[PDB]
Ligand binder design. Structure first.
Ligand SMILES: O=C(O)c1cc(-c2ccc(F)cc2F)ccc1O
Ligand SMILES: O=C(O)c1cc(-c2ccc(F)cc2F)ccc1O
Ligand SMILES: O=C(O)c1cc(-c2ccc(F)cc2F)ccc1O
Lengths: 115, 111, 111, 115
């Protein structure tokens, strides 16, 4: 699988468990087409979103539902969600890990792109 | 004004200068309507995006055009942009820290 | 002055207020000699740590007392402090963003 | 092993490979005693630093040699290194992952403490 998503919690120092993640791909008319979704495991990781076959070059949006994560913990968050938007490229390395570190009023996201 | 945007370059340790920023507000038909736009100054700050009268309650999206920033500096980054989405109901400062394959964003909300 | 320290609270989305900061400078016998100290104001800023005359070349350590900050707010954090170590040879702004189990730190260096 | 260290590179979007990591523990006289060391693998991770037997409660410093990492890539860095200082606690969870995301003038560090 060429796309993995991992989410961590900076308040409790733990994986962010059961976080909904929605992936979209930009359609030719510039709207966002649903592409894949899931929820992070107990390790904070979401595997198996897609296959090499279906992960063609294009612009993708990964939406991490941070607001519902914080509310389910009883914590008031700022953002509606975390959005990661990128163009995949076949010339570059094969595997994309999208990682997000969450705080209630802040988040960081990084791409680890490897083979 | 009630909404300010600050952008820093983590590779250079400098303000991110000339960064375009587009603000959208979700419309009654839940599409993104253009709201305001501008670009950061030499301090990395974007002031005067809006007014207290116009910054009404709603769901806002601050799009920071990071890809155009890095490309103007001769670099091919990972992200298309950095999108900060929040509901407003007060001064908001939206801060972002940029690296070619990473960004961090924080909200500082005061009165 | 040539050295300023800014601290933000990522849980609250606010300046980190009353944060103690101790600056050290490596001595000729490579131990850490105390250099200056202070604490952040209501803006989360610490101005006036030193002067251009006293901020000579050297290896500096800015210790931000994050543990005491979180504990004063009733919270048990992970880190003892946040230590920023750098060589100087110009205004340095040392910025830190704090969560109970995480911190980020950036250097903004200008003239 | 109760202590793992992982390092990522935010400029290239990759693991930070071959980064020297030194761990110290505070001695009774308040000096830092060498405790363990290694270099990150090709996955950016450093396993096997210590055992449960030797990782007693105490104050530990993890020093990540970021400056040598950036210089070996030909990139001018700001910090001498990244320091993570914490008190381990036996009552809390069993495993400590110390993770650091590196940029030349910035770094982030987080603790993932699990079982
Ligand atoms: O920007 C981010 O998402 C980020 C991520 C990490 C991180 C990455 C991978 C991992 F297994 C653990 C981490 F803490 C550490 C710091 C950080 O800022
Ligand atoms: O999330 C962010 O936007 C962020 C911002 C800063 C930062 C903000 C303002 C400033 F003058 C200097 C900084 F390093 C530092 C770290 C960081 O993560
Ligand atoms: O590394 C940091 O210290 C850092 C700092 C900021 C930040 C700095 C200054 C400010 F006025 C607001 C901020 F969110 C935002 C993100 C960040 O990582």
């Amino acid at each position: 699988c060429p796309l993995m998503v991992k989410v961590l919690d900076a308040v409790r120092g733990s994986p962010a468990i059961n976080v909904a993640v929605h992936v979209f791909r930009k359609a030719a008319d510039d709207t966002w087409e649903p592409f894949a979704s899931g929820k992070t495991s107990e390790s904070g990781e979401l595997h198996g979103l897609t296959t090499e076959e279906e992960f063609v070059e294009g612009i993708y949006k990964v939406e991490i539902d941070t607001k519902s994560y914080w509310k389910a913990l009883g914590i008031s968050p700022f953002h509606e969600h975390a959005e990661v938007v990128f163009t995949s490229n076949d010339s570059g390395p094969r595997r994309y890990t999208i990682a997000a570190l969450l705080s209630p009023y802040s988040y960081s996201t990084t791409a680890v792109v490897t083979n």
